[PDB]
């Protein structure tokens, strides 16, 4: 009786493998363990929101209140929680935008099942209680768009839009990050009478070069794209050449050569006083079509010799390294032109222009300006941040990213249209779905009636991180919608919130409804995926 | 969640502990399945300090080998229980429960509940006990018939030895119960017999004696070995060193009386001697003849043994406690504590005393009594273990014996009584019982469980159980519309079935009644354990 | 139905890793700010006195301002870290008032 | 470092989570072990044994759980044997859903504790007299009535079978222990257990059974009628509290001591003899020289007895406990005694004393039990404290509360009718006080194997139309009264149940940190 | 006699052996039982470096989970090549192993050798075949009609 | 088939206690063993045996 029989089953598979089945655990036991991150994310969550300091194994430290940023570099050792990761993950590579909502949304979904569960409902007419409500959600979300806008062009348009986004993020700045993301899209898109058949737009037009020192209020936008660089051979000319063709070149400058590895033989010395002066006079003459042209600038993504450095400094021509192949492209779309990987010369159709370029030093160090002024750019911008701290300005660039993914699904279906923000359409998407539970009688009632209790999470959490009582100001937003003026009744953050209502109308704070289709899809089935998994298998180490 | 309550704590629950109580009792029946029968295999046990036993019996198996195995220790403490009232049963209860266990794990792997299971057993139980009523035979014990208390003794007899022993210790065994069997129908096991365990000649020279035998003998050589007619006095009171209450002690003025106080000492030893020899004095006729004898049971000075050599009494001490007990019904005489009051009528009779001196060790011998009121059972044995393996057939053979002469009833062996259950339970109408739907599953199991010690006899002849027990049932249906009521056992030798009253094979009524009950408990209490946790603080 | 002996809980975060909310924790970082600032406190002024700061290598090093102080010194807590982005960006914007 | 302190120190609304999953986990081990179907847990021990029971309160008692709030359970154990004895495992099981079902908030709507606390102290009151509505009053002197309401806790057992010969057992040991208000005390019950036998076979025998067999060959083991005299003083010679130190001048003075020692003794016996008592008993040991003038004149020699046993042998057959062998008279011995006697058994001898039956001192009566094996006599044991327990309850409140789960459902219908009517802060704790109630009629259905989600929801509405009496069935899983159902639980057995949980849950609520290995 | 040729030799034989291989397909089946039909569970598959897999299929199951038990081996590998040729009856054939062991070790304790059990199976194997035929019924494919590939398909 | 099942359900009885049965040929190995003592006591067998 000392020992116990350690079980027949012992000697199957292994012992690093665990096993967490129906009643042998889990059961709202690993959905109580998801509550310490999901804590975690409803701290992060609205513009009043607490950023997370999170240190790599690498030291690298990333503050963010993005859930997907911030579970990313954080090891996790839970499966089930790598459900939820992988579903902000998806939020942030295709929409970009609501990858807090997925994790909230997602988490309180295994929360109210913890009382389903508890009075005996299995967990097979649990999935199809989320999947009939998830279809009537999507379908009611059409009626309650107000925003619907043909313009997508203006400035102000963007207000809607852009700006409710930034809001939340680094929500101590609201027109100063605006205006950067706004002339940012009003440079890359062309300017034309009508533009129809969605023109293309990606998230590689609009650039973030990270500089330190500077408020962020002395922050502006190029049209251009700033590198850090070293400058070779001479001083610029300013505006004296007015616009410059510039050509650039992927191969790098240098007499051609082989891919096998040459070497010279020399079987007389009348070779040898000739070899000095044929490399010279070989490199120049394809270096002296390039000065015909008019080309004051070139580019090699490759490293130059000094050979042919030697040549371009007396001509004044511009030569710039750009190691990297990816931003090479995108200096290609400032001018305008075609990278050529021959030399040969250049071809008039193939050159782009540039207005001037400068070297200055914005926080100390000397950079490369490529602003054009009066010239033609297509999809290409930068923004130049300003700050203090390495880790503050992080975030900043991810909400630049997050401001500029929303023009991208924006422009790219028929549109985004708007939603009411500021907990208004989360307690609209309550009254409908309780509603619906009860025009179809079964014992899908008690999935329905739950799936309408999630979304309590969202209205609250405004209010929470405003220091203010749940028990208070969200009942009595549900007495304002008694009956448009009943619509826009939304959560106020602010000390005059002791009235609990304020005009979403008058802030314009608006969300996208495509973001919200696309969030509450994937929310549902990572929720879905932890209640059909009945056995967990896990292995050693 | 207990992962929670303890940082390092064990649990096993629902299939992870169904899998516990149904291999640990299959492994524990393994070792007693061979056991099981007069042809069951011989097992040796030999521990860490060099002991060895040798014996047939499933208790010694359980109390000197440990279990680890929590499941086993709730049937090994139901098996050495069952031994300790009924004498039997210890292997019978083992193979009971561990088989049912297994007959009723199939179906719970079916999806039925053990509840609704364990609740079929109690009705099934029921029926064998209203069966018992029918099935047992009456005996009278007015006829006096010895040769019903031969066959029913070889029934133990032959399982833990073979026939050379049987042999010997039949009429043993039945001349023991003999003297147990009087007017007042009281029955006494613990007094009426003991054994002795003695090394000499041969384990087959065992013999019956009528009269007490003690270890121990006349330490002064001028003591007489063998006195025709001894009268044994029963002495409690102890002559020798005192506590002394603190020893305060004697002081002496001058050499003179360093002396004349130590002749204090012999005072109130001879004070007693005095009382003992105006005993003597009565029964000084015919002083050559007969002879007077002493029983003590505390040790005696040997300042005080001299006295009794020039008288010829022969002097026991440091005898055992409950020898003191048997002296009246030996001799026939009574207890006597203090040495004040003494009378003839006290005084014992024995018609012949002797001492046998082997070794360094003395035995003492009486026997040859009028009416001797008991008996003993002088064990002989080769080796060690040898006395332990007679010590254990011969135990276990009183109480098979002793409790046939309790009630006057006797119930069959060679499994008859497990056969004539299955044919009744399975042919039983459950319109009548009280289980109904899924619970008649449950009797089912209970039935079937039965069937396994007839065909557990037969796995040790080497005949295939499926086979021999095909006649068995053949014979029983034609029985039944012949108007003959015969009950069909076992033969193992042959193969074939035979039938337990002629070949004389008994079991006793107590055996059975307390095993099945028993057993129904213990695989009950099993079945619906769901779960098997340890905790503690250590 | 499980695998075998007893199963140990999982831990959602690694093994190793110290996590820690509510207010216990800004006070834990605004003290690693504070105690950093009274090595900086006497250096401001003209009146203010040098620090001497030997690294790991042995390599000697004086500096009065705060910029160069905090490289010398390897920064681990994380909000120590920002007084020391905000010294080395008033050092490679301006350059003055590091210490301030 | 500080003191003794710190290491990982839990704050926040965490070390409340800790409290409630920790405090979850216990009665989610005994959640099987409640209904009639309930299945049985095997325990092991430190020492070697093994404990197999369905209670909750043996089960949680042997169990080591090291946590700060999750002992504060185990403690709720012995709450309710020691007061009641029957409902441990309803306790924790309730116990353990309240903490859960009413305070799943401050995770969501941070409220106070204190808050909720104030609703519960609130709900209790009300919960009291919704049981006092619904329990209906039933007569002591009916035997009919207290064999059906004993079975109440057997059923659960598994001496179910034996049901209805245990009521006879149950019933015969709490009336003749009542003493004329009507207190009665298991101290005197005797558990004392007999290995082997049938369980029809036992019978509650009046007097009490001794292990030891009779010193003398001559001590008669059959007495018409018996008279005991109880001695608490050795029958040996008494050294004494000083050292005697003789000084032995003459040879002649040192018989004499040991003259006396046989005299002295003689002395103590021969005023035994005034009230010729036939049994003697001796609480401690005796000497085999005073024995004899004893056997000369009748009286009976045994072994030393503990003290526990001799105060139920005074109570038996009147005798008077005299320790003084000199102020020994006929008023303190014992009589009406209907028989002696001595059977064989091979483990141990046994001795009965039999009453003759024919207000005074409370009779003291043992419960013989025989069973299987060692482990079965320790569960009916178990079974008959709970059993007789049901009897205490009923004579000192002859309240009748429903059972099968009725109690706690009829409770949670009327929280919910007034949770919409009371309004304010506090309707959330106090409705979800209504919740946890629904709990424990919802493992009756879980254990019997049907939908909790039909049954219930069918519960709820027959209850208020149809009556206060309608609950689940445990066998058939369905919906009944318990009128027709024949089975009823006192009315303390379920007060207790909802005292004991509410008033612990108020204590875990209030917990901020927790600290671990400060000193000792 | 085995330890008289090798000292790290060991070995189980008669009912020793005989017990590992009811056990273990009994253990195999208990795990992989609950994953037959539609309303079969669902398994979630770990792996150290952190990698999860959801399938009902006893092929991916066995193929990432690596068996110590040797008599399991056998069931692996005969499951492994079930799914190769049919690509269906992983799970189908692992029940039938152990039921199959299970049913025939009930007869072994009442006395019956293995040998006779044997010529049981294939003699009822035999006359499967022959009402499989007759239990078969043929369709006709020249149609190429949707209904019928349909409920087949999402069978 | 890296490791044996070990004799499972073995945990019965303690790990020190071993059983050895007629079959397997112990009951051989136990006369075998007989041999290696009864030799020694061959030699010293009549007047010419070996102390
Ligand atoms: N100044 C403000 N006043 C009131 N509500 C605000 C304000 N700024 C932001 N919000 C609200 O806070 C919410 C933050 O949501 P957010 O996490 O940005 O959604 P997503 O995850 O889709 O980006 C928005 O829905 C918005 O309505
Ligand atoms: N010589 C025999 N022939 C047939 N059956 C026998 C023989 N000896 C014993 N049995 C049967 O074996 C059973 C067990 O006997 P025994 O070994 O004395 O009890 P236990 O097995 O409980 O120790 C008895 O019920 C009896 O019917
Ligand atoms: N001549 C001065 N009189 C008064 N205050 C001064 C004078 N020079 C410097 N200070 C003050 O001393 C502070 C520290 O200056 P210093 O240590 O020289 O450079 P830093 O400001 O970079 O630390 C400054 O904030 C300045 O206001
Ligand atoms: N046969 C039954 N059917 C339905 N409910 C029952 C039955 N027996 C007991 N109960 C319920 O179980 C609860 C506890 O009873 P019981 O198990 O006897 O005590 P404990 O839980 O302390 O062991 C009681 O409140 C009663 O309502
Ligand atoms: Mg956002
Ligand atoms: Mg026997
Ligand atoms: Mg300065
Ligand atoms: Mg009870
Ligand atoms: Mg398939």
């Known amino acids: 009786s000392l020992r116990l029989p350690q079980n027949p089953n012992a000697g199957l598979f292994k012992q690093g493998y665990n096993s967490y089945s129906n009643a042998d655990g889990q059961i709202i036991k690993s959905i109580a363990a998801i509550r310490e991150l999901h804590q975690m994310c409803l701290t992060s969550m609205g513009p009043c929101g607490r950023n997370k300091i999170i240190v790599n194994h690498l030291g690298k430290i990333i503050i963010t209140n993005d859930a997907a940023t911030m579970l990313r570099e954080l090891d996790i050792v839970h499966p089930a929680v790598k459900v939820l990761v992988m579903a902000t993950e998806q939020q942030k590579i295709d929409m970009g935008d609501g990858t807090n909502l997925v994790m909230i949304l997602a988490g309180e979904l295994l929360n109210v099942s913890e009382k389903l569960i508890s009075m005996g409902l299995s967990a097979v007419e649990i999935i199809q209680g989320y999947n009939m409500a998830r279809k009537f959600t999507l379908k009611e979300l059409d009626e309650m768009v107000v925003g619907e806008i043909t313009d997508k062009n203006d400035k102000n348009e963007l207000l809607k839009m852009i700006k409710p986004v930034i809001s939340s993020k680094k929500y101590g700045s609201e027109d100063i990050l605006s205006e950067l993301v706004s002339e940012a899209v009003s440079h890359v898109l062309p300017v034309a009478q009508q533009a129809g058949e969605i023109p293309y737009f990606n998230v590689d037009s609009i650039r973030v070069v990270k500089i330190m020192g500077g408020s962020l209020s002395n922050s502006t936008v190029i049209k251009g794209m700033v590198f850090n660089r070293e400058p070779e051979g001479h001083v610029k000319s300013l505006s004296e050449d007015k616009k410059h063709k510039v050509a650039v070149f992927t191969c790098p400058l240098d007499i051609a050569n082989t891919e096998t590895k040459g070497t010279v033989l020399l079987h007389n010395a009348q070779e040898m006083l000739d070899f000095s002066k044929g490399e010279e006079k070989q490199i120049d003459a394809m270096m002296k079509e390039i000065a015909d042209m008019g080309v004051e600038c070139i580019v090699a993504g490759a490293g130059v010799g000094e050979l042919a450095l030697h040549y371009l400094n007396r001509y004044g021509i511009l030569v710039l390294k750009v190691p990297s192949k990816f931003e090479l492209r995108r200096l290609c779309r400032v001018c305008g032109a075609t990278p050529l990987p021959r030399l040969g010369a250049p071809t008039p159709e193939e050159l782009g222009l540039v207005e001037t370029v400068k070297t200055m030093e914005i926080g100390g160090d000397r950079v490369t300006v490529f602003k054009q002024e009066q010239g033609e750019i297509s999809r290409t911008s930068t923004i130049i941040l300003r700050g203090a701290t390495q880790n503050n300005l992080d975030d900043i660039e991810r909400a630049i990213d997050d401001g500029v993914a929303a023009v991208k699904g924006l422009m790219k279906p028929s549109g985004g249209k708007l939603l009411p923000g500021a907990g208004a359409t989360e307690i609209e998407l309550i009254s409908r779905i309780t509603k619906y539970g009860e025009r179809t009688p079964g014992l899908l009632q008690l999935a329905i009636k739950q799936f309408a209790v999630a979304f309590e999470v969202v209205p609250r959490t405004l209010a929470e991180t405003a220091g203010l009582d749940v028990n208070e100001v969200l009942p009595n937003l549900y007495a304002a919608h008694n009956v448009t003026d009943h619509l826009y009744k939304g959560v106020d953050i602010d000390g005059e919130s002791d009235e609990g209502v304020k005009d979403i109308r008058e802030e314009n704070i608006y969300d996208m409804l495509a973001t919200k289709k696309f969030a509450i899809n994937v929310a549902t089935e990572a929720a879905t995926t932890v209640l059909s998994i009945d056995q967990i298998i896990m292995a050693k180490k | ?538 | 139905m499980n695998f075998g002996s007893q199963t140990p809980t999982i831990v959602v975060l690694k093994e190793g890793t110290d996590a820690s909310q509510g207010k216990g924790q800004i006070i834990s970082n605004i003290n690693a700010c504070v105690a950093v600032q009274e090595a900086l406190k006497p250096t401001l002024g003209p009146l203010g006195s040098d620090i001497l700061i030997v690294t790991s290598n042995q390599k000697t090093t004086i500096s009065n301002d705060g910029a160069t102080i905090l490289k010398l010194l390897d920064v681990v807590h994380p909000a120590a870290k920002t007084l020391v982005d905000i010294s080395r960006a008033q050092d490679a914007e301006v350059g003055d008032g590091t210490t301030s | 470092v500080f003191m003794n302190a710190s290491q990982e120190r839990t704050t926040g609304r965490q070390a409340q989570i800790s409290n409630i999953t920790a405090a979850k986990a216990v009665a989610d081990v005994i959640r099987t072990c409640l209904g009639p179907k309930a299945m049985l847990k095997m325990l092991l021990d430190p020492m070697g044994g093994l404990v197999l029971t369905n209670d909750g309160h043996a089960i949680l008692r042997e169990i080591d759980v090291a946590h700060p709030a999750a002992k504060s359970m185990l403690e709720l154990s012995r709450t309710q044997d020691e007061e009641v004895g029957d409902g441990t495992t309803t306790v924790i099981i309730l116990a353990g859903e309240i903490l859960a079902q009413c305070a799943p908030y401050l995770i969501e709507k941070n409220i106070h504790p204190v808050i909720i606390i104030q609703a519960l102290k609130k709900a209790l009151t009300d919960a009291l007299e919704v049981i006092k509505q619904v329990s209906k009053p039933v007569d002591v002197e009916n035997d009919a009535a207290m064999k059906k309401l004993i079975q109440a806790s057997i059923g659960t057992k598994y001496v179910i079978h034996w049901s209805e010969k245990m009521c006879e057992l149950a019933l015969d040991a709490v009336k003749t222990v009542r003493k004329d208000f009507e207190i009665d005390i298991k101290r005197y019950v005797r558990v004392e257990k007999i290995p082997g036998g049938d369980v029809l076979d036992s019978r509650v025998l009046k007097g009490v059974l001794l292990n030891k067999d009779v010193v003398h060959p001559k001590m008669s083991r059959h007495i018409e009628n018996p008279r005991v005299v109880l001695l608490d003083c050795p029958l040996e010679y008494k050294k004494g509290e000083s050292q005697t130190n003789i000084e032995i001048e003459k040879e002649e003075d040192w018989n004499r001591i040991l003259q006396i020692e046989e005299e002295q003794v003689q002395l103590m016996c021969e005023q035994i003899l005034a009230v010729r008592p036939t049994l003697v008993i001796t609480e401690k040991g005796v000497s085999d020289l005073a024995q004899h003038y004893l056997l000369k004149g009748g009286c009976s020699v045994l072994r030393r007895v503990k003290k526990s046993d001799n105060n139920r042998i005074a109570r038996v057959t009147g005798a008077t406990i005299v320790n003084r062998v000199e102020d020994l008279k006929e008023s303190d011995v014992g009589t009406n005694c209907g028989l002696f006697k001595v059977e064989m058994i091979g483990d141990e001898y046994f001795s009965f004393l039999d009453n003759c039956k024919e207000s005074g001192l409370q009779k003291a009566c043992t419960i013989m039990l025989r069973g299987g094996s060692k482990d079965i006599l320790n569960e009916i044991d178990r079974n008959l404290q709970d059993a007789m327990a049901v009897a205490r309850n009923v004579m000192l409140s002859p309240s009748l509360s429903p059972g099968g789960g009725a109690t706690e459902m009829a409770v949670s219908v009327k929280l919910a009718e007034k949770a919409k009517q009371l309004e304010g802060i506090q309707q959330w704790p106090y409705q979800a006080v209504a919740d946890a109630m629904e709990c424990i009629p919802r493992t009756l259905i879980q254990n019997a194997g049907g939908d909790p989600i039909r049954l219930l929801s069918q519960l709820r509405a027959k209850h208020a139309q149809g009556n206060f009496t309608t609950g689940i069935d445990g066998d058939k899983g369905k919906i009944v009264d318990m009128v027709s159902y024949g089975i009823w639980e006192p009315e303390v057995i379920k007060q207790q149940s909802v005292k004991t949980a509410i008033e612990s849950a108020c204590l875990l609520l209030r917990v901020d940190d927790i600290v671990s290995g400060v000193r000792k």
């Open chain 2, 1 to 538: 969640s207990l992962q929670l309550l303890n940082p390092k704590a064990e649990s096993l629950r629902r299939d992870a502990a169904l899998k516990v109580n149904v291999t640990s009792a299959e492994g524990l029946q393994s070792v007693l399945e061979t056991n099981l029968g007069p042809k069951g295999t011989l097992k040796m046990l030999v521990d860490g300090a060099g002991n060895i036993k040798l014996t047939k019996d499933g208790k010694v198996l359980l109390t000197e080998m440990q279990i680890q195995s929590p499941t086993a220790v709730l049937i090994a403490r139901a098996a050495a229980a069952q031994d300790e009232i009924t004498g039997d049963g210890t292997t019978t209860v083992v193979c009971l429960v561990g088989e049912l266990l297994r007959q009723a794990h199939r179906f719970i792997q079916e999806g039925v509940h053990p509840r609704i299971i364990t609740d079929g057993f109690e009705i099934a139980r029921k029926e064998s006990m209203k069966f018992l009523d029918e099935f047992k035979i009456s005996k009278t014990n007015l006829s006096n018939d010895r040769e019903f208390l031969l066959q029913v003794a070889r029934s133990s007899l032959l399982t833990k030895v073979d026939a050379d022993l049987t042999e010997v210790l039949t009429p043993i065994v039945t001349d023991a119960v003999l003297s147990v069997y009087d007017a007042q129908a009281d029955n006494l096991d613990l007094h009426m017999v003991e054994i002795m365990q003695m090394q000499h000649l041969s384990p087959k020279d065992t013999t019956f004696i009528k009269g007490l035998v003690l270890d121990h003998g006349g330490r002064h050589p001028d003591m007489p070995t063998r006195v025709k007619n001894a009268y044994v006095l029963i002495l409690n009171v102890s002559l020798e060193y005192e506590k002394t209450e603190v020893n305060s002690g004697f002081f002496y003025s001058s050499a003179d009386q360093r002396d004349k106080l130590a002749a204090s000492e012999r005072k109130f030893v001879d004070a007693k001697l005095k009382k003992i020899i105006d005993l003597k004095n009565e029964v000084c006729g015919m002083d050559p003849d007969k002879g007077f004898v002493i029983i003590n049971q505390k040790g005696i000075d040997p300042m005080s043994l001299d006295v009794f050599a020039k008288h010829n009494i022969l002097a026991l001490r440091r005898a055992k406690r409950r020898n003191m007990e048997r002296l009246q019904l030996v001799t026939g005489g009574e207890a006597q504590n203090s040495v004040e009051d003494l009378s003839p009528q006290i005084l014992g009779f024995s018609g012949l005393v002797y001492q046998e001196t082997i070794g360094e060790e003395k035995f003492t011998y009486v026997t040859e009594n009028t009416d001797p009121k008991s008996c003993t059972i002088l064990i002989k044995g080769s080796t060690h273990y040898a006395l332990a393996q007679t010590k254990d057939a011969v135990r276990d053979g009183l109480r098979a014996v002793a409790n046939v002469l309790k009630d006057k009833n006797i119930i069959p062996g060679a499994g008859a009584f497990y056969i004539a259950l299955s044919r009744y339970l399975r042919s039983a109408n459950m319109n009548k019982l009280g289980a109904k739907g899924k619970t008649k599953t449950g009797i089912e199991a209970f039935a079937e469980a039965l069937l396994v010690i007839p065909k557990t006899l037969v796995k040790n002849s080497g005949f295939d159980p499926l086979d021999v027990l095909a006649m068995v049932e053949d014979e029983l249906d034609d029985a039944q519309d012949s108007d003959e009521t015969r009950y069909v056992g076992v033969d193992l030798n042959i193969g074939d079935s035979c039938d337990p009253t002629i070949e004389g094979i008994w079991d006793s009524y107590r055996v059975l009644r307390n095993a099945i009950t028993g057993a129904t408990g213990i695989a009950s209490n099993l079945l619906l354990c769901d779960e098997l946790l340890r905790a503690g603080r250590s």
